[PDB]
Write a sequence for this structure.
């Protein structure tokens, strides 16, 4: 990996001094699949990758970078990992029903069993 | 047979009195509340299980809505035991047990927060 495209969020298991970079150019645009069991730490791995993707900058400016990450947080756990983020629960989200398509609008209102 | 669901006592019972009966917060307080549904009719057993399951669920749901306001550690954690869990929650899509399926599934997906 080139030094500009290097993205480090982990180190080698058998050698903690060896940083393991990924091609962060190619790490994100192609889709990522983080798989493990419950209690393996995949919520921590997701959080650590996104923290590393947020604090990093081009160094020519001061402020927020251009990362845009949307988390479908269902266990109410990523509030702590990103304290300076925008969190939207039911009491704050306003999702318009009219932006739903015909397929979504059928499930919201009809019953399908009868 | 349907005196528990349609008797004269069921007309005059208070909504508060129903919850403390199902949860054992009445005059006689108990940690365990046995719900003997042996003599309940089978065409009615789905209706009674679904209602008690929902009433306990919104008891825990509405407890969290005052807990955000009260911001104090005073919780009532509830564990519901379903002997013959395959009966009130079958994989069959037949209409006889859909109400008890929907109530148990609602505790399965959302009951962890509440
Ligand atoms: N890279 C890591 N190093 C050390 N401990 C970790 C690491 N990742 C997760 N853990 C710990 O393991 C536990 C598992 O949580 P986590 O893996 O985030 O849950 P899940 O895998 O169920 O989403 C966490 O409490 C965390 O403290
Ligand atoms: Mg998790």
């Amino acid at each position: 990996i080139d030094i500009n495209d290097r993205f480090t969020f982990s180190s080698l298991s058998l050698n903690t001094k060896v940083s393991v970079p990924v091609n962060g150019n190619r790490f994100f645009n192609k889709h990522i699949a983080i798989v493990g069991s419950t209690g393996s730490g995949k919520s921590h791995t997701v959080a650590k990758i996104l923290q590393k993707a947020v604090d990093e900058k081009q160094e020519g400016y001061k402020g927020l970078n251009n990362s845009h990450i949307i988390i479908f947080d269902i266990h109410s756990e990523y509030e702590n990992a990103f304290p300076n983020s925008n969190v939207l629960n039911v009491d704050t989200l306003t999702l318009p029903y009219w932006l739903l398509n015909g397929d979504e609008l059928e499930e919201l209102f009809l019953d399908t069993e009868a | 047979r349907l005196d528990f669901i349609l008797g004269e006592g069921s007309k005059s019972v208070t909504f508060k009195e129903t919850l403390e009966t199902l949860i054992s917060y009445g005059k006689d307080k108990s940690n365990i509340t046995i719900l003997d549904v042996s003599g309940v009719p089978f065409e009615v057993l789905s209706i009674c299980v679904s209602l008690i399951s929902r009433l306990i669920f919104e008891f825990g749901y509405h407890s969290k809505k005052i807990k955000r306001k009260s911001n104090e550690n005073q919780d009532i954690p509830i564990l519901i035991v379903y002997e013959e869990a395959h009966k009130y929650a079958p994989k069959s899509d037949l209409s006889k047990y859909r109400t008890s399926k929907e109530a148990i599934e609602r505790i399965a997906k959302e009951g962890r927060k509440y």
About this structure: Residues 66 and 72 of chain B are 10 Å apart (CA to CA). The longest helix of chain B spans residues 42-70. The pocket of adenosine-5'-diphosphate (ligand 1) is lined by residues A 36, 38-44 (CB under 6 Å). Chain B touches chain A at residues 93, 95, 98, 113 (CB under 8 Å).
